[PDB]
Amino acid sequence: WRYGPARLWYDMLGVPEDDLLADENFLMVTQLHWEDDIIWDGEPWYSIFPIDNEDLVYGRWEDNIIWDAQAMPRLLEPPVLTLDPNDENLIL
Amino acid sequence: PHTYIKTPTYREPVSDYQVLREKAASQRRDVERALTRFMAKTGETQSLFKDDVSTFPLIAARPFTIPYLTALLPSEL
Amino acid sequence: LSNTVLPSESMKVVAESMGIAQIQEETCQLLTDEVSYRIKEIAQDALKFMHMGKRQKLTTSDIDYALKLKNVEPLYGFHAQEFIPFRFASGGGRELYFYEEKEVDLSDIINTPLPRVPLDVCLKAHWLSIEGCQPAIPENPPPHELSVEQQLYYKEITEACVGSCEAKRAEALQSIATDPGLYQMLPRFSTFISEGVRVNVVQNNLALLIYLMRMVKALMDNPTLYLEKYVHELIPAVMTCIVSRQLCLRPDVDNHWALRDFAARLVAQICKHFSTTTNNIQSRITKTFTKSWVDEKTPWTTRYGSIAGLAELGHDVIKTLILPRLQQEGERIRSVLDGPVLSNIDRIGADHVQSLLLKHCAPVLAKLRPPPDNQDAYRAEFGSLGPLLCSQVVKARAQAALQ
Amino acid sequence: RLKPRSIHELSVEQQLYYKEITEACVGSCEAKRAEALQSIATDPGLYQMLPRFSTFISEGVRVNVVQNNLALLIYLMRMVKALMDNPTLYLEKYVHELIPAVMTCIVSRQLCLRPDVDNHWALRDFAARLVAQ
Secondary structure (H helix, E strand, C coil), X not given: CCCCCCHHXXXXXXXXXXXXXCHHHHCXXXXXXXXXXXXXXXXXXXXXXXXXXXXXXXXXXXXHCCCCXXXXXXXXXXXXXXXXXXXXXXXX | CCCCXXXXXXCCCCCCHHHHHHHHHHHHHHHXXXXXXXXXXXXXXXXXXXXXXXXXXXXXXXXXXXXXXXXXXXXXX | CCCCCCCCHHHHHHHHHHCCCCCCHHHHHHHXXXXXXXXXXXXXXXXXXXXXXXCCCCCHHHHHHHHCCCCCCCCCCCCCCCCCCXXXXXXXXXXXXXXXXXXXXXXXXXXXXXXXXXXXXXXXXCCCCXXXXXXXXXXXXXXXXXXXXHHHHHHHHHHHCCCCCHHHHHHHHHHHHCCCCCCCCXXXXXXXXXXXXXXXXXXXXXXXXXXXXXXXXXXXCCCCCCCCCCHHHHHHHHHHHHHCCCCCCCCCCXXXXXXXXXXXXXXXXHCCCCCCCCCCHHHHHHHHHHHHHCCCCCCHHHHHHHHHHHHHHXXXXXXXXXXXXXXXXXXXXXXXXXXXXCCCCCCHHHHHHHHHHHHHHHHHHHHCCCCCCCCHHHHCCCCCHHHHHHXXXXXXXXXXXXX | CCCCCCCCCCXXXXXXXXXXXXXXXXXXXXXXXXXXXXXXXXXXXXXXXXXXXXXXXXXXXXXXXXXXXXXXXXXXXXXXXHHHCCCCCCCCCCHHHHHHHHHHHHHCCCCCCHHHHHHHHHHHHXXXXXXXX
16 A cells, blocks of 8 residues: 555655574574573563464565575565454454 | 364454443543654643643644634545 | 458448348458448548648548548538437347437527637737746646544654654654554554565665664563564564665665664564464574574675574574584685785675674683683684683673672 | 454363363362373373463462462472373473473472471472482
C-alpha cells in the first residue's frame, strides 16, 4: 500500500504501485551458564500463549537476509503489506 | 485417549462488552495522552503553573492567517 | 499483424436482402476482400483531409470529401448530430442488430428553440514566451484501520525518526520506549522498520539505518508491549544490518562498523529476551552466523558482522565457535603484514576484524589458560592475540584491585 | 480483516493428560504419583509435550525455594528422574533448564528448619547428586 505503513520509504522510492557448524555447538545448554540462570532468591512470562507464533517458528527468516548487497535473488519489489490480522486481545 | 486421540478445538474469543469497552477506552486515552505530550514537548509550550513542563504541558496557541478554514471545515467526511 | 477484412458471413446476410437464396463460400470470399479493400482506400483518404486540414478528429465531412474524390455517390444524412445506437433482437434463432428509428411531429420542428447565432472569425495576439519562459496571462496553460488520533501519532513518530533534527528524534524514541498503549500500532512499526531496512539496498544510507536500529532498541525497552508476535520481522532487519556487505555509501570513510556492534548487541538482547525452546531463535541465529563465518569467499565486512554477533552472544559461544578458527587469523595476516596491494579497502576491514577478534578472545584466553602466560602469544597465532591476552589478564588484576 | 483462530498443536486429550500428570506428580496421593512417574518413564509420545514439562519443573523449583517446601521439591526431583530414564524422548535440548534446577536443590539453604527434615533434606540432596551424576 502506497499510503500504508512504510509509506515514507515508498514515497522516496517513487514506486507507481497504488564440525563447529554442528547444532550441538548451538545447543542452548552449551551456550547457557546454569549458575547465572538460577535466581537463588535474588530479585518468566515466555511463550505464555499455547501456540507459539507460526511465522517465527516456520518462517525461513534466514533466506530473507541477503549476505551480499551486490547479488540479490529478488530485485527491489513493492512488497505491499499483507494487512493480515495477528496476535490476541485485539479490539477487532 | 493419549494413544490415539486428537482434539482440534478453536480458541475462546472475548465477547465481554464491558472489558472490550474498557480496553478500547483506555487505549484511546493512552494514545491521545502520548500524542499530546509528544507534541507539547517538541514545540512551543505553555503552562498553567510556573515552570510546569513535565506535568500538564500545553501546546502553545499559534495564530492562523485564515482561522475560519481550520474552524468551520470538517476534517472527516 | 494480418490483413483484416469484413467477415464472409456478413455477405450472406447482405445477399439475402437482395434475394439471392444460396451464395457459395468462394463468392463470399470474393466479395469481402474487395469491399474491405475499398474501405481502406477511403479510410486513408479521409485521413488526408484530417491532416492537411489540421483537425486530428476525422469528422464525417472528411469521408464525404473522400467519396467525392473517388467519384462514388455521397452518403446522405450523416452531418446531423447523432451517435452510435444499436438495438439487439434476440428472436427464435436469428440474432441481429438494427436501428429502431423514431418519429417526431412536424410542428415540433417548425417550433423548436433556435440555437444562438455564430460568431465571425477574428484574430487575437498574445505573447507566448517573452525572451524566456511563458507569461502567466490567461491565454496560456496554468503552470483494523488506525483511528485518526493514532494515525496522527504514527505519522509524527515515524517522521520524527527520519532525520530533520536530533531533539525531536530523542523525544520520539523516549515516547516509543515509555508509553503504555502503543499496541495496535506495533504491526505498523514493524512493517515500517523492516521495509525501511530493505530500502537500504536502493540507497545505502548508513544514517537512516542507525535511526531504524535505535527505533528497534527503543521498541525493545517498552515494558507494556510484547514483541513476541512480531519478532519474526525485526530479527532479519537487525540481521540485515549485521551481515550485509555494503552498509555505506562511501565504503572507506563511513563507520559501518558501529551499526555493526550496535546491531550485534541488539540481536544478543533480542535472543536473550525471546529465545524459548519452541522458538529456537538463538540456535538458528548462531547457525546463520556460523555458516557465514566458516564459509570462505565472505567479505571482511560480513565476517566482521558474524564475529561481532557471535562474540556478543556470550562466553561459551566464543569458546566453541570462535576459538577453533583462530588459525584463520593467519589467513587474515597473510593480507595485512604482507602484500604489494596496499591501497585497497581490504586492509582497514581486515585489521578491524583483527582488533575485534583479539579484544573478544582476550578474556576467553584469560579464562582457559595458566596465570603466567609467558609465551602464550608465541603459541598463539601471529603472537599478537597473546599480547592482547596478557593485557586482558592485567586489566582483570586491575579490576580485582578496584574491587 | 477477520480470519479464523489458530488451533493448538497439542491436543485436548494431550493437554488433559498433561494436567492430570502434573496434578498427580505434586504428590497428593502416593499411588497416583507412582503411576504418573511410570507414565512419564515410558510414554513414547511424551515428546512435543516436553517443553511444557521442563518449564513446569524449572519454574516450580525457583518459586518453590522461595519457601523451602521439601515435598514439592522431592516430587519434582522424582519427576526429573522419571523424565531422564525414558528412552524415546530427546532430552539434551532441555538440559539447560534441568541442570540449574538440580544445582539449587543441592546447593541451597533450607527456609524450613532442618533438625526435622534435614534427614529428608539430606535424602533430597542425595537424589539431586544422583541425577546430577
